[PDB]
Amino acid sequence: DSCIQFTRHASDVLLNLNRLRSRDILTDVVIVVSREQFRAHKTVLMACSGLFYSIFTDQLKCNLSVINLDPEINPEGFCILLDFMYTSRLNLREGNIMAVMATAMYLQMEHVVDTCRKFIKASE
Amino acid sequence: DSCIQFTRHASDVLLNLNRLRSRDILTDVVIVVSREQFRAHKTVLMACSGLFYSIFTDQLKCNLSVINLDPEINPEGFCILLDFMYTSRLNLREGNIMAVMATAMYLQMEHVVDTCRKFIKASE
Amino acid sequence: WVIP
Amino acid sequence: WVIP
Ligand SMILES: O=C1Cc2cc(Nc3nc(Cl)ncc3Br)ccc2N1
């Protein structure tokens, strides 16, 4: 086509989606990870995670307001990944890399899994 | 912080949100523009438009499944802007620039209004 | 704004 | 991935 493109549009959209999350505006699901609860937008979760994409395209699960993750999932690892989904920034540290990679594999977040594997290979 | 960032994350999120729109997945509102109807995600509309941000943060309007725009609004201008919201690409043409700018002013989409004013100033 |  |  003969379209023009606004370079910063996608970043500005995600920044605004994160502002809505911070003020709990139009969040439509709670993700339960052991004793912790995380409110989010189903569409953002689906856009970032192969697991949430499969869950919310399911004709029965699409209508659930609460999703319980596998008990092996670490709440801090999930929190770091939820922040990444809404900001593009990943708080990857020596103390959390194993939990973050295990959570990203479960959530089917391929680019996160890839950088975790590379950071782990560098330290061996 | 000591975060790393994935450059393409915001673009990939928006691409996936547009795929959901194309398959009518988790769309939660219909925007009526005269005889035309456009299905969309309230969160994406709010993230792109000052008008939709004000509408869906309203305690009564946040619960509406149908929003009727002002009858002066052109359906093609709205369609071009809805596409821009979900892709960052604006199909700006000599034949549609006036309708697109008028719609972007009504929707409170400042960057679109700015490029329209510049393209119009160049042709005078 | 750019030419994509 | 970059250092932002
Ligand atoms: O690593 C990742 C990230 C991700 C996101 C989605 N999300 C969607 N995929 C498609 Cl094709 N359409 C709409 C949506 Br929402 C699917 C798989 C994966 N795997």
Ligand SMILES: O=C1Cc2cc(Nc3nc(Cl)ncc3Br)ccc2N1
């Ligand atoms: O030209 C524009 C585009 C736009 C988008 C929003 N959206 C939001 N703004 C804020 Cl501050 N927080 C959350 C959201 Br969603 C507000 C105003 C405007 N004006």
Ligand SMILES: [Cl-]
């Ligand atoms: Cl990813």
Ligand SMILES: [Cl-]
């Ligand atoms: Cl804009």
